[PDB]
Subunit: 369 residues, 4 copies
C-alpha cells in the first residue's frame, strides 16, 4: 500500500510505531513553489486583496468584505468557471463590495481536495498539494481568494496565495492555530465556539496579536523554532452554534460590547471586526436560509451598523448538495457539475441577488450620512 | 534576537514572511532519542504500564487506573523524589490500583505565566526549547526506571520527542475538537483520554473517540525532523475524561449514569458487555479550583465503585510532596531559587498525607466491589 | 536568477556565504523513487546483472564482462534505440559475454563544456539539475527493462537517486584517491571498479580496492534528503580498471602480467586460487583518444584470453549508434536541435558496425580459451 | 551497534541497502553553529585573517603567510596552549609575517590508524562524529579568539560545520583532482590552496585553480542539513602548494622558477606584474618525512626571499610544543591518558624552540628583501 511500510505494524511489543502503517514522501514547500511560481498578476491581485481587506478592517474603506464561494472545492474546473462568474459580479459591485472567493479544500469531520483529490479513498496528498497549488495560481489570476487553516503544515505550501484566512471553529481554542495566525501575512478570522460562546474567539484574537515562539515546519520541510510578530489584523466570525443563531442585531450588539470590554475595539473610534457567516449554524444547515441571513445583516448595515466588516456565504454554480455515488454506480464521474459534495450551497442566481442586496445596503448606509 | 533573522520582517510588500521574526534550530527527535535512550528497564516498565492500562480499559482487570502526580513539574529533582514515594505506594496497592505517575510539563494558560518545563526550563520567562526538551526527556527516562508515567499532548510536534516514554496520555481540553490531535491519537502506542466539553457535554469527547479509532493519512513531522505523509492504524484504546464544566461538577453518580448512557447511544460501549471507559478528573472543574476538595471527589467515586460501579476505569489527581501552590518569587526576592521544595507553581495539589489516604480509600473500594 | 537568491552575494564582510549565489530546491531521493519505481522486470534484470557480474568476478563463470555503450548519454531517445540493438547482440553472445550497457551521464570537464545529462539536460548551458535527475531516472528504468546497466560515480549525492538501477559501477580516475568515493564503494549493492591513476600508477587503485572492502562510518546524504552518519559493511566485489595514463597504454600482456603480480603482492587476489579482477578500458588513455584504435585494443585483449589469460574479467568500450563525435552547434546556427542523431558529443565512439565485430572477436576468444582444455 | 539498524543487512536479494549497517543521527550545521556561536572577537580575528591573506596573495602586502601548527590536533587543551605561544610570536613578527595557525583535525590514511578529532575524539577507535564535531567547533571558536586559523578540506559536508572559522584553507592532496573539491573551493569565503600531484607535476593544481575560479552549480548539503542545489560565484583567491613528490623535493629555487613559468603559461599569474601564488610546504614530501629537515627547507625559502624572490606567498610548517611524535599506547598500557603532552600523534613536528628560530629567519629574510 504505502511507500515506506512499517514491517512491524501492530506489534505491541514495540515502543512507538506499531500504530503507524508507514510513510509517503512529500515535496518540500520550496519545491512545490518553484514548480508553480507566482506571476506579477498573481502578486498584484493577492497584494491588492490583502490591502483591501485591511483597509476595511481598519475603517479606512466603507465597503463590505464578502467571502463567498463553494463549501469545498472538489472540482478545479468547476471552481475556475465559478471564479469567472464571480469575477464579473465583482467588477459590478467593486464600489460597495470587496469580493474574495472562498477557496476551501476540506470539510472537517471525504477529507477534501488536498487529502484525497481523486475522491476515492486513495490518499494522494502529494498530488493533492500539486492540484491545489496550480488551481490557486489560476484562481488568483482572476480574483483574491480566502482559505481555512485547518492544519499547520499545509500553509507552508499555499500561504503566499491567500488574501484572508479563517480558523475553523473546532480549532479556535487551539494554541497551534493562534500561533499560526500570529505569523501569517494576511488577516485571519476566528469563529465563535461550536457551543456559541464568543469568549474563545476574542481570546484567539488577542493571542494572535502577540509574538510567539513555537515549533513549526519551515519551507525546506524541516521542523524548527519560529518567531512570529503578532497579527493585529484579525477579526471574529459569528457562525451560530448550540445556543442558536447569532446574526441578529441583538447578537451583533452583544458582540460589539464584548469587543469593547476586551479592549479590542475603541468604542469612540471603532474598527469593524465582526464577520457574519450566513451558513453553518446561522442557516440551520439549510442553504435556502443563507439569503435570509444576508438580508438581515444588510438591513442592519442599511440602518447604520458600522462594525460588521463582512459576510461569509457558501455558494456554488448549482444550488444544494449531493453524495458521491459508489464506483459501482458511476463513481466521482457521475457527480453533477458545479454542485457541492459537502455542505449545500446557494446557486448562482441567489448569489447575484445576495450580492445586489449587500451593495444596496452599503449605498443605503452612505445615504444615512 | 534569533539565530536566523528575517531581515525583511514587517515589509508588507512581500508575499509571505513579513510576520516571521526568524528561526532557531531544533535538534531532531532522532538526535535527542539517541542521546537519551531507553534501557531495558525503561522498556519493561513502560510496556507493562501500557499492558496494564489496556487490560483495565478492556475489562480484563478489575483494578483502578490512578493517574496521580503534580499539576506541572517545574523541578525534576522533586519529581524524582515524588516518584520514589509514589512507587512505594504503588507496591502497597498493586493488588487494587494500577498507579501511573502524572508527568505533565505545562499548564495551558490563555493568560500570562510560566510556559512550562519545555518552553522555559529556567523558570525565568525565557524560551529555551532545545534545553527544555533535553531536560524533559532525561527526567522521563529517570522516572520510567521507577514506574510508568502519563503525559498530556498539547501540540503535535513535541510528542515525537517523548512519546516512547508514556504508558497513557491525554489531549488538552482546548484541542479535544481538533482534527490534528484526533489524528495524533490514532497513531500513538498507548491509550489516550479526551476531556468533556467546556459546557459539560460529552459530544466533543465522543466525537474524538470515534475519530481516533479510525486510520488516517496526514502531514506530520517524523523522527528525522522532516515532514512526511504518515498513515495510522486507528486507536481503539481511548476513553473519556469527566472534568466538569459550566453545568458544574460531573463526578457524581448521576453524571456518571448520563455518561454511561451517552457512550452506549453513541455505540462506543456496548451497555450489555461494557468496557470501562470513564475516567474522573478529581481536580480542575470537579474540585471548584480548591485542592482540599480532591479527596472528597475521590471518596465519592470510591463510594460508587464500592457499590458496584464498573464503568469508571480510573481517576486523575493533582498530587505533590507538599500541598497547595506558590508563585515564583520576583528575581528581586530570589527568583526560582527562593521556591519551596516539592510545592506546585501551577494548580494547587493535595499533599503526600492526603495522597496516602486517598489511595487507601480507592483500594478499599476495589476490595469492597469484589465482595459483592 | 536562482530560486533562493543570496541577497548578500559578494559582501566580503560576511562570515560564510558571500560566494554563494543561492539555492534551487531538490526533490529528495525518496520522492524521485516514488514517482519512478522499479517494476519486477527491472528488478529481475538488475539483480541478474549483479549476480552475473559477481559470478565472473569470483571465477565461477568463464564469461567476459563487457561494459559497452556511449561515452555519455545526451539523448535518451537514442540511448533506448542503442539499448535495443545491444540487447540483440547480448542474446547472440550470452553464451560467452555478459554484456552490460554503459549508461554514463557526463564526461568530467577539467576546463569547460557540457556538464552532462543530470547537470544540463537541455544542453544549453542552463542548469536544471532537478529536471536532469527526473530524466535520468526515467531513462534508466526504461533501459533496465531491456538489459543491465553500468554507471560512473562522479559525486556522492546523486547515487542516492539512482543506485538501485546499476548492476556494476566505476569510480572516475580523478577520484580513485578520494576517501569519499572509497567509502561510497563500501556501501553500494554492486561491484565497483577503480581506475588506475592519471599518472599510470596502479597503487591508488589497489589502495582503493582494499579501502572499499572494509566497513566505514562517514557523513552522507540519505534517502529522505537529510545528512546522517552511515555505517557500511564493506564491498569485497571490487576490481581494478586499466585505462592507460602518462606511462602510456597498459592493455598489453606485459602490463597485464605486472598488474596480476601487483594484485597478488598486495594480497588482493590469492595467487593459489586467483580470481579475475582486471578490467581493460579500450578507450581514453589506451586508445590515444582515437576511436578507431578501440577495436585494436580489444583484439589484443582477445588474443591474451584466447591464449589462456584468466585474470582479465572484462573490457570497457565506448560505443554509439554512429561513430566519432560532434560539437554542439551555436544556438545561432541551430543549437542542440541540429545535432546528428546517435553521435557522441563527448568522447568519440566506435559505430554499431565495429561493435558487432568487437563482440564477435571477444566471444571467439572465450570459445578459443575453452578449447585449451584438451 | 548503530542507532537505526538495517534489519536486512547482507540480504543480496534487495535492491539498494544490503551493504548499509545503519545510520546515526547528526546534529545539523545550524544547530551546532547555534550552540557555539562566533563572538565579535572571533569575527574580527577571522575577518582580519582573511583580509591579510588576500592582501598578500594580491601583492598589496609584502609580508609572508606562515601557516604553522600541529600536524593534527588530538588534544584541544594543548592546542590552546600552542595558540597562545604562537600568538606571542605573531605579535613579535607581525611586521614581516602574517601568521596563521594550522588547525588540522585528521591525517589522511589509506592505512589503519587514528581517524582524527572529528571521527574519533576519544582516540580509542570508536566513532563518535557528533561529539567530535562539537569538540572541534568549540576549540576553533576558542582558537580564533587568539589568532586566525587554517583548515584542510578533506570532505565536502563537514566544511558546513566549520567553514565560518577559517581564514585560509587547503584541499587534501588525494582530492586535488576531485570535481567535488573544486566546486567546494569556488563557494568558500577564504583563499584555498591546491597541492601539486603525487608525481610532482603542477597540472592537477593548475587545473584545480582555474576550475575553482569559475561559478558552479551542484548538489550540496546546506546549513539546515538537507540536500539542495547550490550556485557558487567562483574563487579567484586561490594558490598552489609545492609539497614534493616522486620527482623529489620541489622547494628549491629551480623548482620555484619552473612553477612560476607554469603559472604564467597557464595564464593564472600576470607574467609582467606577478601576484604571489606559490606556497611552500616545508614538511611531508619536501622534508623526506624527517622533521629536523623542516628548518632547512625554510632557510632555503628564506634565502630566496632575501635575494628578491617575490612569487612565494608563504610557507606551511608542522610545529608543536614538543618535537617529534608518539604512538597512542595500547589500552592495557594506558591508552590516550598515557600520552606525552604537546607531542604529535601523527606526523612528527618541530618543537617550540625550532619554531621560534624558523620564524626569526623568515622575518629577517623579509627585512632583507626590503633592503633591496
Amino acid at each position: 500500500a504505502m511507500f515506506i511500510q512499517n514491517e512491524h505494524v501492530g506489534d505491541r511489543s514495540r515502543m512507538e510505531d506499531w500504530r503507524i502503517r508507514g510513510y509517503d514522501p512529500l515535496a518540500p514547500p520550496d519545491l512545490l513553489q518553484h514548480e508553480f511560481p507566482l506571476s506579477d498578476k498573481n502578486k498584484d491581485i493577492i497584494l491588492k486583496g490583502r490591502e483591501d481587506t485591511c483597509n476595511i478592517l481598519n475603517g479606512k474603506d466603507d465597503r463590505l468584505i464578502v467571502v463567498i464561494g463553494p463549501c469545498s472545492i472538489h472540482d478545479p474546473e468547476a471552481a475556475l468557471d465559478y471564479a469567472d462568474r464571480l469575477h464579473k459580479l465583482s467588477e459590478k459591485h467593486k464600489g460597495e463590495l470587496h469580493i474574495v472567493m472562498r477557496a476551501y479544500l476540506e470539510k472537517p469531520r471525504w477529507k477534501g481536495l488536498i487529502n484525497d483529490p481523486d475522491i476515492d479513498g486513495s490518499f494522494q496528498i502529494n498530488k493533492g498539494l500539486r492540484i491545489a497549488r496550480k488551481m490557486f495560481v489560476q484562481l488568483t489570476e482572476k480574483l483574491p481568494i480566502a482559505g481555512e487553516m485547518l492544519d499547520t503544515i499545509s500553509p507552508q505550501f499555499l500561504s503566499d496565495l491567500f488574501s484572508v484566512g479563517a480558523i475553523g471553529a473546532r480549532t479556535t481554542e487551539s494554541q497551534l492555530h493562534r500561533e499560526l495566525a500570529s505569523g501569517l501575512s494576511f488577516p485571519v478570522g476566528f469563529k465563535n465556539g461550536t457551543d456559541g460562546t464568543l469568549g474563545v474567539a476574542i481570546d484567539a484574537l488577542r493571542a494572535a496579536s502577540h509574538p510567539h515562539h513555537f515549533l513549526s515546519v519551515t519551507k525546506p520541510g524541516i521542523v524548527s523554532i519560529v518567531g512570529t510578530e503578532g497579527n493585529q489584523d484579525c477579526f471574529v466570525i459569528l457562525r451560530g452554534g448550540k445556543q442558536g443563531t447569532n446574526y441578529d442585531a441583538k447578537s451583533v450588539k452583544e458582540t460589539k460590547e464584548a469587543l469593547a470590554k476586551a479592549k479590542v475595539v475603541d468604542p469612540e473610534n471603532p474598527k469593524p471586526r465582526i464577520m457574519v457567516d450566513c451558513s453553518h449554524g446561522n442557516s440551520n444547515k439549510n442553504h435556502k436560509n443563507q439569503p435570509l441571513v444576508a438580508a438581515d445583516v444588510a438591513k442592519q448595515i442599511s440602518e447604520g451598523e458600522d462594525q460588521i466588516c463582512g459576510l461569509m456565504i457558501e455558494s456554488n454554480i448549482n444550488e444544494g448538495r449531493q453524495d458521491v455515488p459508489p464506483a459501482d454506480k458511476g463513481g466521482k464521474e457521475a457527480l453533477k457539475y458545479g454542485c457541492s459534495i459537502t455542505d449545500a450551497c446557494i446557486g448562482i442566481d441567489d448569489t447575484e441577488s445576495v450580492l445586489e442586496t449587500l451593495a444596496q445596503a452599503i449605498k443605503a448606509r452612505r445615504g444615512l450620512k
